Each structure stands twice: as C-alpha cells, then as structure tokens.
Amino acid sequence: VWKEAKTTLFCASDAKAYEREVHNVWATHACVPTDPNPQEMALGNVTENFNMWKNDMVDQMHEDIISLWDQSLKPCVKLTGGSTVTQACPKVSFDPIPIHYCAPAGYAILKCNNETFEGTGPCNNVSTVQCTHGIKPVVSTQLLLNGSLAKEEIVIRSENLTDNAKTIIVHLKESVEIVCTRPGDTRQAHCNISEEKWNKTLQKVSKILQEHFPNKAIKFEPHSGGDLEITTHSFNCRGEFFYCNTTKLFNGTYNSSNTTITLPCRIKQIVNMWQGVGRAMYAPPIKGNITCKSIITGLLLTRDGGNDDNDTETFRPGGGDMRDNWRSELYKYKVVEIK
C-alpha cells in the first residue's frame, strides 16, 4: 500500500487525569487515549522499501518532545547569545510515559516485520497499523535507555557504514541494567553496571561489527571531545540532570560477589539545552536518594576516520542529536496514503 506521504500525525497515550507528572499533564491535552483493541493488517507477497534516516515521523516527534520540555521543565534562567529570560522554576515530578503516534483519516502507517531489518532498503514482511507501539521519549546521549529491543539478533543501523560522519545505531537483543543514584558534596552521584553483562554485550557487538568490517580489529574507546552533554552519558532522572563518565565502558578490545562497574556522575544545574542553542540554569537538586533503574537497549557510536595501519577500526560513543534517539524506535514505520 506504499504511498509515502506527509500528514500531521496525532499522539496517543494513557495519561492520568490526577497525575501532576509532566509527561502526563502534557499528554492530557496533546494526546488521545490509547485504542484498547488496535488492529493490525498483514500483507502477503508484499515487499516495500523504508528509510529510517529520512522519515517525517521522527521530526514530528522531535517537535513534540521539544514543546513538551518547554512547557514542563522550566529553568530558573535561560541565556541565549545576548538575550536572557528569567521565570519561576518550581520543582516538578518527572518520569517519561509511552507515546503512540497515529495516522489520521485517509492515511495509515506501515510496520516492517523483518526483524533483521537494518533501516534502509527493501522489506519483505510488511503489515499496516493505525498507530505505532508505546515509545518513551527518553532524552539521553551515548546510551539509549528504556527502549524496545531487537528480537532476533543485534542490529547495526547506519545510513552508510563506510561514511564515518554518519551515526551508528546499535540495537541490542539483550538489555543491560544501569542503576544511578544520588545519595541523600551533594552533587556527586554514581552509576552501576555489571561487568559480565556489559563486557559480554560489547563482545557480541564486536562480532557483528567484524562482519561489516572484514579483516579489521575492533576496538572501543572513550568520547573524542565536545560539550559535557555528549562526552558523558547524560540523562534526566526525576527532574535532575545527570552527567556520567563513561570511560570505563569503553576500554579497547572485547575478545570472545559478581563485580560491578562504577561510573562517576555529577548533577548539574547549568545545562546546555538539547532543544536548541542556549544555556539553561535549573534549580538545585532535591534531597534524599535520587535513583533511576534504567535499561540500556541501544548505543550511539561513531567510527574513527583517517589512514589506518594495524588494520584496526575504532568506535566511540556518539549522540547529541536527539532525532537519532527517536529513529532508534521509529525505524520500522512509514506514513502512507490510501488509494
């Protein structure tokens, strides 16, 4: 039923009328309640092409989450170039909820059921839905949190792998739990990840990469540089902005009483806005244990360029553009027209 088109999709999610939590309050006005019995329609001997990297759904979602954060997470000061705005910045309750994107009347959404699909090119098992699955709008860098998981094997996605300026998205099959805590210096926090889980997952990622880069040695190293937002694994927990050193997660070659990796984190109040150009200053953190038990379900990587002896290909954590975070979940979808 391929008829790629552009329409304004509408959001849907199960918000609570009583909930003062910011994603809920936003969803209360922006979205509609979830269809209890959503219909899927299969398509036999039907094969169509997708491009996750050129998809209008990603941009719509991006605009929504931007306008969500703008209403919900009010900073004390917002400084932009030479201008400045200062409003009241009360503390808020914060925990993302799953948002569904849906096609209006006359249109529909194509779901790709090729569970080994790399995002671009032809797809053999295709069906039609009216809404995508539940997507948590988790804003983060380096690590993709609380996402869906690859269901057959680890998938590597890139618009062009040979193009070192294109972001690489790893979609994990087995999730790794990450627990972050600020104990009740009060700006210092720390993350905890198991070595067994993490080591193993990078071993497994090394193997898949070896297939895409034959006769090359695969090696992971820490971030090359830039703003703290992207040189650390940064993410928001319960309103507070965490910044975690991921050096220990990337320690070279991954060959083929449990022991944990402790990543040192800091809570910041002076933050670069991911929405756009600007520095935002938020309120000092709340008291007590501030804790997030999340799951790592994907990575953002960037491959090293330039001439290489030793036949070694080096990968580093990426991130920064959040559109990437959304396409890691919207890759299997395209918006079509009916005729």
């Binding site: 040979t162 193009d163 070192n164 360029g305 001439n307």
Partner: protein
C-alpha cells in the same frame, strides 16, 4: 592503506586540447573532483562521479569504468590550468598538475653525464649527474645503471620550465651514493629514452678514468 591512486602526476597540454585524468579505487564510495587554480582555494568540479557542480561548464565530464574514474576536460581554456584532486570520503588523490605547453617540432635530447668531483669525494658522498638538454615533448625517462644494474629510489629528476624562446625543456637527474658504494663498481651510466630517439641513448664513464 590509502588506496586512492591518481595519475598522471604531470600533464603538459595546449589550449584547445583535452585533459584526461584518472583515479583507481577498490573502495566503495562516492567520488568527487576538485580544481585548484594557483593561489586559490580549491573548488568542487564533479561530485558523485559524473555530476557537474554549479557554474561548471559542459566541457568537464566525469565517467566510471570499474574502479577507474576519469575526469575529461575538453576545449581546454587558460582558466582550466591548475592542480586536480580526486576525493572519496576523507581521502584525496596525490594530485595531477595540468600545465601549459607550447607545440613545436620534436627535438631529441642532448645527453651529458658528469662524474662526481674529487673535491666532493673528500666529503664521503658521490653525486653523479645526468643532463638532458633542450628537448620536446616534456615526457622523458632517465634510468641509472651501475655495472649493468638498474637503480631504485636513489635518484632525483629536476625539470626546468618550458623555455620562452625555443619552447624546449631540460632535465637533470642526480644519482647519489655513499662514497663507499661508489668506491666499488667501475662503470656508471644513465639511459635516456625519448620520443625523438629511435633507440635509448646511454652516456657512461669508468671510475678513475679521464
């Protein structure tokens, strides 16, 4: 492993002729050609193999025949002379310098060989010099032979600019050895090939002779 090979190194043409520049690559990737006029920033000429950039005349064309990419420049104008580079992602070719040449009768080279001065040999280094004088066209090859043995990577050619008065070129290949490697061996010679010689010309000397 750069594996982006551009050739030829130098292309000596006239206005109105056509320049044919090449680039081998085994790697997957889009290829682009740039032009650098003397003292100016490079500019994009062809991208994606054969697509002409904006403001680039139909005279420029790109083609692909396997791993072999070509940049053909027809009806060569004076604003077309400079250095050309091919590019594939982050890598560039060595460059091809297309430079003006004035047409004239083919003229064979006059070849002279020069043994190292004894004043020099007191310093522990031997400099043999082969001179190719007043020839046309520019394409020429000099090969060194020490006792019927070809030399590798121990010589340096040097070319004058085309003469304004008689349109000829002159080349100077200098072979350098340590005094030690020169004390051995008797015969030293350079073998010159050109378009104006039916068979290669070789000029030699025995060491110690006069």
């Amino acid at each position: 492993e750069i594996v982006l090979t551009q050739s030829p190194g130098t292309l000596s043409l006239s206005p109105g002729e056509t320049a044919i520049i090449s680039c081998r690559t085994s790697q997957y990737g889009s290829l682009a050609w740039y032009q650098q006029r003397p003292g100016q920033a490079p500019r994009l000429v062809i991208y994606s193999g054969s697509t002409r950039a904006a403001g680039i005349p139909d005279r420029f064309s790109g083609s692909r025949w396997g791993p072999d990419y070509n940049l053909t420049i027809s009806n060569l104008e004076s604003g077309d002379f400079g250095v050309y580079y091919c590019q594939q992602y982050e890598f560039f070719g060595q460059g091809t310098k297309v430079q003006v040449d004035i047409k004239r009768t083919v003229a064979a080279p006059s070849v002279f060989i020069f043994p190292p001065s004894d004043e020099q040999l007191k310093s522990g280094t031997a400099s043999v010099v082969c001179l190719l004088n007043n020839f046309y066209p520019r394409e020429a090859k000099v090969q060194w032979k020490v006792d019927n043995a070809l030399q590798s990577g121990n010589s340096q050619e040097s070319v004058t600019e085309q003469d304004s008065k008689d349109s000829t070129y002159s080349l100077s290949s200098t072979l350098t050895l340590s005094k030690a490697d020169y004390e051995k061996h008797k015969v030293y010679a350079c073998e010159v090939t050109h378009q104006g010689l039916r068979s290669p010309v070789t000029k030699s000397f025995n060491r110690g002779e006069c």
